[PDB]
Symmetry: D3
Subunit: 279 residues, 6 copies
Amino acid sequence: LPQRWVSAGGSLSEWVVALGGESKLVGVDTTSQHPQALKQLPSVGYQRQLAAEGVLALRPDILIGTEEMGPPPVLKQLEGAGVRVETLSAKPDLEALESNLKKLGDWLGVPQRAEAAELDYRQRLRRQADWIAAAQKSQPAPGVLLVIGNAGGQLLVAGRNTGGDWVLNRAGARNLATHEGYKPISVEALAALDPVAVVIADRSLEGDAARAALLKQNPGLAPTRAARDGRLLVLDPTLLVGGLGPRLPDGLAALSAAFYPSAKPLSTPLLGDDSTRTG
Amino acid sequence: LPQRWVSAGGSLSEWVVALGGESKLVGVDTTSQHPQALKQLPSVGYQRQLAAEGVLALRPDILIGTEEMGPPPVLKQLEGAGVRVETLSAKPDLEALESNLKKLGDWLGVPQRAEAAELDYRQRLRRQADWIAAAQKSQPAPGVLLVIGNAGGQLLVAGRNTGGDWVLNRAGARNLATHEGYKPISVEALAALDPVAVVIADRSLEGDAARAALLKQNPGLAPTRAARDGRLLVLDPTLLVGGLGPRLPDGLAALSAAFYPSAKPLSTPLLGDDSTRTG
Amino acid sequence: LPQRWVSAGGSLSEWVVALGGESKLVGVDTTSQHPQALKQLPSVGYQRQLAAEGVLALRPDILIGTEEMGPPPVLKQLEGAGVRVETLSAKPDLEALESNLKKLGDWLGVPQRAEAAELDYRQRLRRQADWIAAAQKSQPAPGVLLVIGNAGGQLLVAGRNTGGDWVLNRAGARNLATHEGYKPISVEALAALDPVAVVIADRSLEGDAARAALLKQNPGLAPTRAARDGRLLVLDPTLLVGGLGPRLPDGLAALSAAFYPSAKPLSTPLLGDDSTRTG
Amino acid sequence: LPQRWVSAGGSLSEWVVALGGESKLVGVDTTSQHPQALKQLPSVGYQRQLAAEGVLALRPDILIGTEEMGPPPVLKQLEGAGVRVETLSAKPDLEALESNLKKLGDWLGVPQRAEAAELDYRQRLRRQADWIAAAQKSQPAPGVLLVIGNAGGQLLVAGRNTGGDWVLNRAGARNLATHEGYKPISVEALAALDPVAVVIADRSLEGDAARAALLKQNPGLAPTRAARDGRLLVLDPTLLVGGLGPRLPDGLAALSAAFYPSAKPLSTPLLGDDSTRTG
Amino acid sequence: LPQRWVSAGGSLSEWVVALGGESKLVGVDTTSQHPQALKQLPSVGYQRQLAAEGVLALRPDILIGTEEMGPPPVLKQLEGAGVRVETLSAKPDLEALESNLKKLGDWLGVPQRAEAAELDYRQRLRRQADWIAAAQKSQPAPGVLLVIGNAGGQLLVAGRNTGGDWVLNRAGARNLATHEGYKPISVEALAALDPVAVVIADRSLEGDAARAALLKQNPGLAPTRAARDGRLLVLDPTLLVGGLGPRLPDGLAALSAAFYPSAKPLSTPLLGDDSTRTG
Amino acid sequence: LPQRWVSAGGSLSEWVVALGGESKLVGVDTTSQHPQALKQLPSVGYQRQLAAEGVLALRPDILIGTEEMGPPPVLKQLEGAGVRVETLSAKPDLEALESNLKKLGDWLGVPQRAEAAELDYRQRLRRQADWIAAAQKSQPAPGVLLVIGNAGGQLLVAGRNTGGDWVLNRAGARNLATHEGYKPISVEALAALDPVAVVIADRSLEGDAARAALLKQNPGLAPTRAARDGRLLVLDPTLLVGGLGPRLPDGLAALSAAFYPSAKPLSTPLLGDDSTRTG
Ligand code: HEM
Ligand code: HEM
Ligand code: HEM
Ligand code: HEM
Ligand code: HEM
Ligand code: HEM
């Protein structure tokens, strides 16, 4: 069984730790910020732009990542250097998660723990769905948009078949975007969609800074119901990297509470609320 | 000499403390937040809406305030109740300051200290003006706007003969507003003015929250050079209440440094900087 | 259904938010500090001294408050201006609460949620009463006093039929005051009552500052068992404004734990404990 | 029943407070730091070196401590001065705890509460043992060492029949030390033992400072699996003074979670984790 | 020259560090809390009650302390064990300081630095005296009392020939106490003295907690001008242990500013101000 | 003159800001963390591994960096895309600095300010050198080592002609390394050198965490005088990237104070001190 692991992809790293493999992690990419301790480990750079020399320097027994791990030539030279490179799935669905956990469990030597993790996860999701069903008795599902930002610019809208879409659906909202994947869209169209709430995952900014930057670069969003009712929600971007992660259930609880404010929220930083208005 | 003082108007209160009369203050209005300890004294409400019963309860020997202290009927019933009511000047000029200090010094019994205060103040201002003169050798004075907000709404623009205008001029900027006093102006006109920087004094919000609210309610400001270059500066609103206060010199140093970024700033929380852009 | 709400009275505002009406609140009075976000909304001043021009500026569809909302002439001119003014009950009893929730639920469009709120509240109270019954098996109910202070002065003692009395009773204590309402009482009498504990709700001070101010202005309290055993408890004053609020249950848990120290406390900032003694 | 208590021995003090006797404590030794408020009470010095004049000055009705309370001559002169000196047991076992609680309950007048405390404690321990049994199905008990340090020096290893040994066993680990009591051992032997994890209870240092000091003065520990896998755990030293204390159950939950990382931890500052590695 | 030093007496330790001997300090007594790092060194207990075994364990080349270091028998057994024990002076005067610095400089090997330290110190004091002279032109020296407390109790008043008296005089105040040394005095007499300000050095409490405890145990102080004008100043107690220390000059600047509020304070945590009143 | 700048190399970015060009910076590499606001700008990745698509997305008018900016192919494709790529000097000497400032000043349009910056810098250095000369009268220059770490591993020692060497020399120390550039060296040799102090610049760790990691991976350093006397100094790594930066003067003041502890330090987070010992 591999003893020295290097992990690329936030959620993958969280899973390794969750399954008890923290002491086996010798290096991680920049999107791996949870738990907090992972930030103090050697860095191999961004997952989409791995540093070959960086991973080799750690004498890794295994390198794990998803489809979004690369570039391809660097991964190839790594394999040629004797490094065991595994590719898990970043797809936004339980089938993928259950498959990733199966593998991680095996390479870690804790197949039972991996099964228990899958079980607790689905249980959390079943509970989240039941809470939503009850909440929709007094309020219909709101139309929402999830956008990925870079200091408020270069907006990418989460369309169908993305982690962002999965998160919006699982939290009880209706994704207003009908396209596939993450794609840029004119603010004009976005404003026309008039979302009840907008979820912002910014790579560089957080809280009010993220909100302010968003409005600076996309003034058209100010006339949306989302901006008017103080519903520009800031989400922890790492929640969307490397496939479905262990913190999503807590994330869904916070989002669904914001989506159905007239319902007693579920029990249990990853979601900043808006305190400003427009009228 | 009066022993129990109640003060209405932020800057007036700061002066009493500055001259050593802190132990004589038994109550203050809500705009008196400096020094921090003044927030722990009994409150008589907002200066423009004093609570008669509130001041009487403190058995004050003297009540001080400016023209903006009121309403008139309440001040009258107070005088009729035997309370000594003094009215100082809130006018934005050294002549007024020097006159206010003269009186405060006398009622406090420290005429010499009051003179020294006037002297240090003007010295600070002379130094600020010389720094600006040198700074304008490599950069011309920027056109700027100062706005008073309420959670980003109900914008009042500081025109000529206001504390806001005095502050912009003393900090080396050109007030773009040509009207008199504080008046509401359409965002359309404001955006047309295209300020290099915008100074925001919000009664309820601070930092990025203030910026975000401002943009939400006034989307048109996003296309100004101010928003584009990350120059929506947030100023401590108390710096503009009750006439010229003792903290303005430090305030001018921060503003002038932001107005002439290519000059080594002057020596020495009251000014939050912008970190977002638009491009 | 009203879309823009202005609320006067801490507890009322908390309820609107609790029922999911936060995005409909456009302004609140100074006693509305919970949740924290409410402090960033436009302010209409103190509930007992509303600013007419202040509420009108917000174009409110409805203004809610209790009997303690005023003054009367200002509320009248508001009604004459077309503003819908509703008056709920501030009375210290479940009948009033259940009636306030009924109305809020209707004007908010969530009658079921309001019913669920009433249900959870009474359940919390039933649980608090059972815990007390069990706790009184090893210790008798302590005689206590609840005082409202202003920077430690102008003390008002909570007598019968006040929110303070309701809170003392519901927390398992015996209110030593036999008068009706909130009334000033000489420290001499208060010290004679010799409370086992004293609860202080100060408008301006908190923690040790509140304790120190209390003792400075009322030296006679130092010889009470309360002062001797380090039981000058500081309570969040907003818990007593605008009728019975949603945070009282958590407040009762903290108080009852302090009142019966030999009992395992109930599950779950609003109550500062004393660490000083006298002997 | 005694009204003024002076307590020597961290855990004893915690118990007095836990049973509701906080207002009866007029003084404590330096190892009594929990709850936090106990640090603000008069100090009688270190438990092993009590200040006679220090306790007498407090006019105590009773002085409680364990075998480790002294020196003997000082305790004697105290008894001769009329002070009631009680000696409880510091022995690392439930029989001793149950006997200490029995006495404290009686002198405090809350025999029932003391019984309930014993009951909750054993219940917590039964639950901890069951969790461990389940955790050992996928992982065998790890060999561990517990050391008491002084700014990383003067290391004492917890052998058999010590609170440290009790804590390691109850948390699911195997104490690698075979000696009796706390004894100094050469780092050479300690490194040879090659612990999977090392628990450090430092009197002066905490967190990374404690780790760094430990390695500075005992370089040989760097080659242990504990140092390599980032498992130099820092434990709150007060958890080991004055017999079995009320916080141990929470302490065991944290330790056992660190000892069996592949198990979902138990529900609920006293244990700092290691983030550094060696490879 | 000695390489391993153990120091008893706050101010002595500060001097060793100030002269550059920090790396030579291997242990200190509990009153040595400055700089902050000294708290992380091995502890030898309280200066007046040194732990023989504690110092020996550190293999010290030298042990330094003042007259207040003891007890005598422990110091004797230490000398008999080969430990070099030096006794400096704790007397409240420059002659003593200059003599202590002379010795420390020699044993540390930096005679010139010690001379420079004496020079800077006296210069600081000359500047403090000149500032006071100018301040007394508009205000006469206030009568003040300095008290040493233990969680607000066991009050010792600083009389003539004490560090407390030296500090009051050097800060521009008149010590109202006419006795010699530190002695207990009835609150009745203390209140009669009616100090303009009271300086409290509490061993266990700080800030408002110290104030509250003081008033609880000495209610009579509430009617003093000091309590009425919010002038119960809390001083860092370590400033008074082990003779004249390097932080006194900064301490004098803060005190003199509080004593002459109508004077612009001198340039540059050791003095907490009072925010409560009585009227 | 270029309006949109992207900067790679910490010190270069600091200079642009220092000269007043902050509003012209639209993106920076990961080593640009000062001022703090630069962390909120879009990221182009690590300087040695720039993201082509990342810079192009910002529509930059100019890209600045040093020799260490790359890789080469990416810079080439950038030039081919019309991006103006400038290469400044990272060499550790004033000639290089003065040349970089000359260029930055010109492209920014503030040649005079750039000259003033060069002037203030050299003045700071002249003052630092004079302070050292005086300090060496009572103490000889200490032999020191500066190491660059990665979570305490992969140690690179700063030899001749490196920013690390420049910093050690300018701070009054003697670099014990005789090799050229940054090179790995066995801990055996490093320990043999027996440095009086060791300066650690860790890419991932800070403070005690950095110290602990260093000792874990390099146990041999524990027997050095540096470890024994608590002189493992942690330096802000960004101070060594992108050539000589504006914060070095403050950095030199802190280091030289640590190198000559018996000298009164110079006036004015970038240097963490060691509090642990070995003996
Ligand atoms: C906080 C500042 C710094 C950060 C964030 C940083 C980050 C990185 C990253 C992400 C890598 C790729 C992974 C790896 O190979 O380790 C790297 C490589 C490297 N870094 Fe840095 N670095 C910093 C400071 C420095 C400094 C001060 C030096 C020392 C002169 C340095 C020298 C190197 C070297 C030699 C490499 C190898 C690859 C190459 O040079 O092309 N870095 N750094
Ligand atoms: C944090 C919450 C509170 C704030 C911010 C607040 C603030 C104020 C202010 C500004 C005044 C006017 C000045 C004065 O006359 O003292 C006032 C008056 C008054 N307050 Fe409050 N108050 C609070 C809580 C309470 C509570 C809990 C009570 C007790 C039942 C109360 C009873 C009164 C009374 C009796 C007056 C006299 C005037 C009147 O009742 O119309 N207040 N308050
Ligand atoms: C932090 C400081 C300040 C606080 C706490 C404060 C608070 C208030 C409050 C509570 C009201 C009543 C509600 C309303 O009508 O909006 C009010 C009204 C008003 N305030 Fe202030 N204010 C502050 C600063 C200022 C400043 C700097 C100006 C600008 C010159 C200003 C101008 C006004 C005006 C024009 C009104 C309308 C009513 C009147 O002027 O009589 N306020 N303020
Ligand atoms: C933060 C600094 C201080 C600490 C930590 C401290 C601690 C202690 C402790 C633990 C005791 C033993 C218990 C007792 O008898 O109360 C004690 C006793 C005593 N302390 Fe201190 N002390 C400090 C400052 C002072 C100061 C400034 C004075 C005043 C001149 C002082 C005068 C005394 C006296 C008179 C005793 C009685 C026993 C004797 O003097 O031998 N202490 N102290
Ligand atoms: C935070 C808690 C603790 C504090 C504040 C503390 C403090 C002290 C002090 C001040 C001394 C005297 C100086 C010396 O000889 O080192 C001492 C001695 C000693 N301590 Fe503690 N201690 C603590 C925890 C412990 C623990 C958990 C043990 C381990 C079983 C322990 C065992 C000893 C021993 C063996 C001595 C030698 C003298 C004797 O036992 O009589 N201490 N301690
Ligand atoms: C906190 C987490 C994240 C960090 C630290 C991060 C960082 C980066 C960096 C440094 C770049 C290179 C510069 C650039 O082209 O902008 C980049 C590119 C990119 N990132 Fe991320 N990223 C994060 C999250 C995400 C998420 C959630 C998405 C959305 C699905 C995403 C999608 C992309 C895309 C599409 C690119 C373009 C290049 C490519 O895909 O190969 N990133 N990111």
